[PDB]
């Protein structure tokens, strides 16, 4: 009311607005675990890992894989990241060339085999694989390049074995000094040090889980991106097998289908209602009753102020005098069987007053009037023998206050630009 003194009557203050505290997230369990197990020199083993959600947490958490460098994106966001294609290149790289695998860094493989850009978006996972890629008297299954005519550019498909000519003598298919082959062997052995040990390098060149269900409680829910807040109640609406959501006349979400189990859930968005305040005047007393409109009395202590709620009081909501009217739930007034004239109306023939049964707020059914019966007979009449003169008072409005509005001054204070 924006005033310190409240007169006698009923006043509406706020709404009930039962609030949730729990979140349900539900999705189908087809996570589509990408075939990283099938992956983890010149003709690449580039596998277009696509049409699936990649889980790098397996490679991050299991024991053998060690290096987890990532470029373009953070290494911890990978499980949250989606791809059009995951270009995985499982390689066998010597460690001195593993140190050269970086965005913008040169080196032997990074200069002569293939190149990576300075803005490279990808991740590199490596681990020593001596028992799988090291042989006695050298491993010659992998051949590398220590010579090239000119330095490379990223993602340039270059597979060739032609002789590089450095001397004045034309080689033309015959090798020798300054007639160099591109292919030379690092000749991996189990006795090499860590800088010469081969690593199983995979250059990964470049999802929400589902929670358990809570029923018959007003919670926040998410069903396949359909977000809402309500009571997930079991229903029996016959959905069509392609139909997943049900709608009302007003095009609101009335029923849903869980993606895991084919059950039809009706949704009721908590409960709401006006919290009217029934009081006498503050000139008389400060005792207050509270009426919740359209709310059953068995659910207000469930949605008490301890629960998240727009009312946050307990002085006139802690049970005690609780009455259930067709208007709603009245707390703080006692129902009295005696019927009086209507003092403070409520609804559906219920009124409230401040009476000494010392003084307290009482509720009652309104009284229409005094019961009467006319002694009607077919040969009897009743004739007055006296009279009285009554002067009554009738009050009528005629005309209100005349006003006038300066629109220019009201909109613009003293601004010529606003004019």
């Amino acid at each position: 009311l924006k005033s310190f003194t409240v007169e006698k009557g009923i006043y509406q203050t706020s709404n009930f607005r039962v609030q949730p505290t729990e979140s349900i997230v539900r999705f189908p369990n087809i996570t589509n675990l990408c075939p990283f197990d099938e992956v983890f020199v010149y003709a690449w083993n580039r596998k277009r890992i696509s049409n699936c959600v990649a889980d790098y947490s397996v490679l991050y958490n299991l024991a053998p894989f060690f290096t987890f460098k990532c470029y373009g994106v953070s290494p911890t966001k990978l499980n949250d990241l989606c791809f059009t294609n995951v270009y995985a290149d499982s390689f066998v790289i010597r460690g001195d060339e593993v140190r050269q695998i970086a965005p913008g860094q040169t080196g032997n493989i990074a200069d002569y085999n293939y190149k990576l850009p300075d803005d490279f978006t990808g991740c590199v996972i490596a681990w020593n694989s001596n028992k799988l890629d090291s042989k006695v008297s050298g491993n010659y299954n992998y051949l590398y390049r220590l010579f090239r005519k000119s330095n490379l550019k990223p993602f340039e498909r270059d597979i060739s074995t032609e002789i590089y000519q450095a001397g004045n003598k034309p080689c033309n298919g015959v090798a020798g000094f300054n007639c160099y082959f591109p292919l030379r062997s690092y000749s991996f052995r189990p006795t090499y040090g860590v800088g010469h040990q081969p690593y199983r390098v995979v250059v990964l060149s470049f999802p929400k889980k589902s929670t358990n269900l809570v029923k018959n409680k007003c919670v926040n829910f998410n069903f396949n991106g359909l977000k809402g807040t309500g009571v997930l109640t079991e229903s029996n609406k016959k959905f069509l097998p392609f139909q997943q959501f049900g709608r009302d006349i007003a095009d609101t979400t009335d029923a849903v289908r869980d993606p895991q189990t084919l059950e039809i859930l009706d949704i009721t968005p908590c409960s709401f209602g006006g919290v009217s305040v029934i009081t006498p005047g503050t000139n008389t007393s400060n005792q207050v009753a509270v009426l919740y409109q359209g709310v059953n009395c068995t659910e207000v202590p469930v949605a008490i102020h301890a629960d998240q709620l727009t009312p946050t009081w307990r002085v006139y909501s802690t049970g005690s005098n609780v009455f259930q009217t067709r208007a709603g739930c009245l707390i703080g007034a006692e129902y009295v069987n005696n019927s009086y004239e209507c003092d403070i109306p409520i609804g559906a023939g219920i009124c409230a007053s401040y009476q000494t049964q010392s003084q307290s707020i009482i509720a009652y059914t309104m009284s229409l009037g005094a019961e009467n019966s006319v002694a009607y007979s077919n040969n009897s009449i009743a004739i007055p023998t006296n009279f009285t003169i009554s002067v009554t008072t009738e009050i009528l409005p005629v005309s209100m206050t005349k006003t006038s509005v300066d629109c220019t001054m009201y909109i613009c204070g003293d601004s010529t630009e606003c004019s």
């Binding site: 609406k237 016959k238 959905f239 069509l240 392609f242 139909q243 997943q244 959501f245 049900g246 709608r247 006349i249 029923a255």
Partner: protein, 215 residues
């Protein structure tokens, strides 16, 4: 040749359950009482796709087996191919053609699923390919052409292919009649019963009585 489509070609526009209501929508629908093109099998000429294609097949021997789609169909770009091989349904996007004359005895996508009347609707919105279907048994003969009645069409296959389609051609089996209609943007007032089935529909641009009904 041409014949009358009657009130055929009504499909579910969305996966929304509605109970005993009249809902107005504006989508690519086949207009009521439109000239639907008639074809009989003794040919299969290449036909335009436009905004959408309504297909109807009346047969018992299952001669009609599939369709081929594409902008040029010259094995240079992607071209759809849906074939029922009497055990499964195969969908491919391959360049090459199965036979030089199309009959039944690098691909970026592959998917494996007069007593008979099968109704289909193929449409392509933002590259996504939607197929609606309705398979029913009928008793009546090939005169009266399409049966005068009502039947809703339910969705089967959605595709993320993103392939432009302007031409298409049916594929038969060699060792039956069909009807081709075109979808246009129309406003329909669909009637939903208690179980969510589309029981009846009203075309808002046909006659002033249905215009008043939609109003």
């Amino acid at each position: 040749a041409y014949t009358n489509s009657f009130t055929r070609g009504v499909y579910y526009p969305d996966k929304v359950f509605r109970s005993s209501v009249l809902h107005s929508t504006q989508d690519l629908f086949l207009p009521f009482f439109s000239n639907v093109t008639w074809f009989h099998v003794i040919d299969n000429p290449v036909l335009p796709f436009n905004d959408g294609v309504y297909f109807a097949s009346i047969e018992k021997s299952n001669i009609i087996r599939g369709w081929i789609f594409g902008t040029t169909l010259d094995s240079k770009t992607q071209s759809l191919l849906i074939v029922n091989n009497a055990t499964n349904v195969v969908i491919k996007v391959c360049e090459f053609q199965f036979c030089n004359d199309p009959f039944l005895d690098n691909c970026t996508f592959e998917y494996v699923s007069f007593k008979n009347l099968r109704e289909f609707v193929f449409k392509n919105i933002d590259g996504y390919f939607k197929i609606y279907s309705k398979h029913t048994p009928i008793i009546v003969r090939e005169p009266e052409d399409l049966p005068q009645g009502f039947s809703a069409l339910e969705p089967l296959v959605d595709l993320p292919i993103g392939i432009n389609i302007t031409r298409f051609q049916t594929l038969l089996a060699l060792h039956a009649a069909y009807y081709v209609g075109y979808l246009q943007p129309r406003t329909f007032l669909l009637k939903y019963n208690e179980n969510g089935t589309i029981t009846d529909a009203v075309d808002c641009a046909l006659d002033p009585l249905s215009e008043t009904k939609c109003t």
